[PDB]
Every structure is written in structure tokens, then in C-alpha cells.
Amino acid sequence: MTRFFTKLDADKSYQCLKETCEKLGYQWKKSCMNQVTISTTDRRNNKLIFKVNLLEMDDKILVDFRLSKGDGLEFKRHFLKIKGKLIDIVSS
């Protein structure tokens, strides 16, 4: 449940997501133009690392979040915090 479609194209979805995570204080590292590793330190000082993939799916951009390291529910909560911060680009 950590994925959603956007109302934007690949590079505007990549851009809106990047600043949202950078404003939230998450580290933003790129992989292959639509693959990004996001890192932060969650409540109680544990490292939280998850990856994002922006893929085109039927004339829409799907932003998928995959937990890489850290607590699962803190991942689910950090995803919901990101989704809320850019809820205006989230497609129905």
C-alpha cells in the first residue's frame, strides 16, 4: 500500500517527490533517472532506508516505495507523511 499514481509526468513527479523528501529532511540519492534511494533516521534513532521507483503505467507515473532497511510500520508511516505532503499531485 506504499505506492500511488501521480497527475504529472516522470520528471515532474521525480522533481516534486525530491523536494518533498528534502524538505522533510530525508537524504535523496539517485540511481538510474527514475530510481531513487531515500534515507533518514526515525524515532528512537534507527536508520530507515527505502527505495522509490517511478515507472510509466498506462500514460501515468506510478511511484512505488520499497522498504530496504528499518522498521516496517515506521516505513508505512513515513510513506504516508510523504504522500500527505504532495497530496495535490496524487491521482485518484
Q: What is the resolution of this structure in A?
A: 2.5
Question: Which technique was the structure solved with, according to the deposited record?
Answer: X-ray
- Pick from 41, 67, 36: nearest CA to 53: 36
For the chain, which residues make up each domain, given as ranges? Answer: 1-92
Q: Which residues, including other chains, have CB under 8 Å from residue 90's CB and lie 6 or more apart?
A: 4, 5, 6, 7, 83
45: cell is 534513532
Which residue bears the cell 515507472? 55
Residue type at 84 in one-letter notation: G
Q: Which residues, including other chains, have CB under 8 Å from residue 76's CB and lie 6 or more apart?
A: 1, 2
